[PDB]
Amino acid sequence: HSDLTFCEIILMEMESHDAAWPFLEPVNPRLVSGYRRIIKNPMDFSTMRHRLSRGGYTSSEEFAADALLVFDNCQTFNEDDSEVGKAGHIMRRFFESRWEEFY
Ligand SMILES: CCc1c(-c2csc(CCCN)n2)[nH]c(C)c1C(C)=O
């Protein structure tokens, strides 16, 4: 629980980031046609927050994998020059920068 505090900090910094707006909650299939058809494993920051809050991450590596899944999904579905596409690249580098401050 307490040993993952730094992942909690990274998640908060991600949630508070200017480019985080597409990723705060799960993508709504009634708003994005066929999204979950194309993306088998959706992921978002609120889902990660709830998993951290219940102690559902057995390692920091599992948390990092969910973070990358947010950005891999975004790059799979969104054009690179779209608003969400741009935000995903910005956020991926932000996450990578924070991760390499510990690893
Ligand atoms: C463009 C739709 C989209 C949003 C989006 C657009 S507007 C918004 C804010 C909702 C309220 N916080 N999210 N996000 C993601 C990851 C999307 C896709 C297709 O991948």
Numbering used by the authors: 1796 to 1898
What does the original paper state about this entry?
The 3-aminopropyl substituent in compound 44 performs better than the N-methyl-2-aminoethyl group of 45. Binding poses of compounds 44 and 45 are similar: all interactions of the acetyl-pyrrole headgroup are conserved with respect to 25, but the charged tails do not point toward Trp1816, but instead approach Glu1820. However, as observed in compound 36, Glu1820 oscillates between two conformers, one in contact with the compound amino group and the other exposed to the solvent; this interaction seems to contribute only partially to the binding affinity. Instead, compound 44 is involved in a network of water-mediated interactions with the protein matrix. The thiazole nitrogen forms a hydrogen bond with water W4, which tetrahedrally interacts with the main chain of Pro1817 and water molecules W5 and W6, in turn in contact with BAZ2A. Water W5 is tetrahedrally coordinated by the terminal amino group of 44, the Trp1816 main-chain oxygen, the Leu1819 main-chain nitrogen, and W4. Despite the observed interaction patterns, both compounds have poor affinity for BAZ2A, most probably due to the entropic penalty deriving from the freezing of the alkylamine tails and the surrounding water network. Notably, in the structures in complex with 44, 45, and 47, an ethylene glycol molecule is sandwiched between the thiazole ring and the ZA loop. It forms a hydrogen bond with the main-chain nitrogen of Asn1823, an important anchoring point already explored by the BAZ-ICR and GSK2801 chemical probes and other BAZ2A inhibitors, and a relevant indication for further optimization of this chemical class.
BAZ2A is an epigenetic regulator affecting transcription of ribosomal RNA. It is overexpressed in aggressive and recurrent prostate cancer, promoting cellular migration. BAZ2A, however, features a shallow pocket, making it one of the least druggable bromodomains. Here, we describe a structure-based fragment-growing campaign for the identification of ligands of the BAZ2A bromodomain.
